[PDB]
Design a binder for this molecule. Sequence first.
Ligand SMILES: Cc1cc2c(cc1C)N(C[C@H](O)[C@H](O)[C@H](O)COP(=O)(O)O)c1[nH]c(=O)[nH]c(=O)c1N2
Ligand SMILES: Cc1cc2c(cc1C)N(C[C@H](O)[C@H](O)[C@H](O)COP(=O)(O)O)c1[nH]c(=O)[nH]c(=O)c1N2
Ligand SMILES: O=C(O)/C=C/C(=O)O
Ligand SMILES: O=C(O)/C=C/C(=O)O
Lengths: 312, 312
Amino acid sequence: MSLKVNILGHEFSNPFMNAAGVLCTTEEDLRRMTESESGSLIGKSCTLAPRTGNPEPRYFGLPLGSINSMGLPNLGVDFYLSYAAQTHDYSRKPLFLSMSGLSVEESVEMVKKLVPITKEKGTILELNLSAPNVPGKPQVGYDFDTTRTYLQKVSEAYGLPFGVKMPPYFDIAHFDMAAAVLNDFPLVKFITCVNSIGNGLVIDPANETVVIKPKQGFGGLGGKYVLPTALANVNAFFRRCPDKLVFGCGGVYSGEEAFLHILAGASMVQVGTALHDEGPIIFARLNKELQEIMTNKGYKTLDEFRGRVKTM
Amino acid sequence: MSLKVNILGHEFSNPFMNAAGVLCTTEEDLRRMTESESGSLIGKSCTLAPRTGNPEPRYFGLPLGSINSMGLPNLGVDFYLSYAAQTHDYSRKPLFLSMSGLSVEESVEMVKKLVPITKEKGTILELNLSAPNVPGKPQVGYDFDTTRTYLQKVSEAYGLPFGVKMPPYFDIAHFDMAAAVLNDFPLVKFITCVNSIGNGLVIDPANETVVIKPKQGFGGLGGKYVLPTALANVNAFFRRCPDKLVFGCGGVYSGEEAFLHILAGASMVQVGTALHDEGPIIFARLNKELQEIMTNKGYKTLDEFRGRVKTM
Ligand SMILES: Cc1cc2c(cc1C)N(C[C@H](O)[C@H](O)[C@H](O)COP(=O)(O)O)c1[nH]c(=O)[nH]c(=O)c1N2
Ligand SMILES: Cc1cc2c(cc1C)N(C[C@H](O)[C@H](O)[C@H](O)COP(=O)(O)O)c1[nH]c(=O)[nH]c(=O)c1N2
Ligand SMILES: O=C(O)/C=C/C(=O)O
Ligand SMILES: O=C(O)/C=C/C(=O)O
């Protein structure tokens, strides 16, 4: 029995890691992720300068998942670059950093700074193209022209293998266009599907009031709301981008959901809402439950079923 | 106490109607809708010529709602025109008809046929710009240039007040862009938010197979998955298109969800997945549950709280 994933030169113990934005903003956070049973971890989506984010309340836990408008609260690119350079124990597990400049200029400047650390330490870049909670800033991934610009300029400035955290798409034509852009950039070695289902509204019937303060209650949705969306996106990019990996993200609460992600095509499986609720101890549970399903089915490795979902 | 609604020069006994596609394809379906306590009803999204739709299985009930790839099964526009002009009992309730031409040309031809019957009978048109289950046809509402063309040609052809069935949006810039196009068409008097969350994917862990045959498992999501997206879309168009009505659609199982939709701005509330599961008795239950909530809050009319959602 093995949960191991061997990708991009690294041996991951299992396919699990935090989703960008959950338990990865502060040094304490990253330490707790490093000490967890997770296969990897990813730093909070950072900007050039620090950000404090949106006003409170900006996170509300729901029966079926979560709503948030965090606003990219981060300690600044320099803090995360220092975590990657000086602090992080790589013998424990590989490290990803999420970078989320609020313009292409910004992202280009941050990405250059990672090149030397990537080269010395092996730190992996995930470019955030799905920031849904910044007032006045659109999700880049729903504009295929802008996406192209970002991938072009980041490819040039970084010049090493990276991946892209995509917004969820809801239309076949969009899968086609998205894939057409991505496939023109060979340095894009992995696609993380998906980010929050953007700009949901949750209202409390009791007090007739929204549950979050920013943007009139409008926040990205995670948790059980997102699983079918996540699987669809994972599979669609799995098929259309065979030269690339796909990382699954959305609605993972257990091994069963992790199994479906991998079955859909996922190499690594990211956990957000559920990790927020349960804490990094969830990864111990996920490993055992995923081992359980594989044992019951007679799968010895993830490679036996990765992307082997059956159609009718 | 009163659940009455006055809009488009018509009186409705209550805000509840079926969602296009649910209990509305056959004459039996529409009689059953007419005989229910629903305030209105809408005919299945029709085409010029009849369709039988996608192969089976094409629907699957889920704990949190539904996935479907029906493929616009419909008896043809002449059948629904005939139902509107000859069969339908307008003393019971007003009738909507959903037209869903798969091209501009087909829609122009169809709406032109509706004009005489709208004039003589009061039949209201809902233009479907969110058909996510017809292979090789994108959802029009995600292409603002195409959307513009439809509203242009339908406006000049039909030349009477009508509504649009929009796909869900998940990005602020898209709300703005959608609203900007819609606000250039004065004959668009109501926006139905929202259609299925499109191109989701359900996999059965047990047999490692998708649950619907068409499009490799990819189908539209309804029910509990959709509520937060539904409300956000309702409220976003309520604010951005103040010279239009918003019809609420998505995640309505009970009086509470109906109350949230109306609070967020909805004039009428359409019911899909839950009506499909429970049958037309649901409208009696919804009428009484909405009144129960209103009784508990001291509301006498829908206009005491319609559009009065509180922000922080
Ligand atoms: C509190 C919080 C914070 C963030 C997020 C989510 C949540 C809940 N998300 C989105 C997240 O990474 C993930 O895509 C979704 O949460 C969906 O996964 P789950 O269904 O929650 O497991 C997010 N994504 C990203 O790329 N960068 C980020 O900084 C954040 N921040
Ligand atoms: C079986 C079935 C059939 C259809 C649909 C759905 C389902 C479940 N839907 C979408 C429907 O009108 C509605 O927008 C969504 O189902 C969301 O509402 P619920 O959460 O299901 O109440 C749909 N919409 C539309 O505009 N025309 C149609 O013909 C259909 N057909
Ligand atoms: O920090 C946030 O508000 C979310 C970021 C994301 O969804 O990418
Ligand atoms: O008939 C269907 O397949 C779906 C219709 C609706 O989503 O427009």
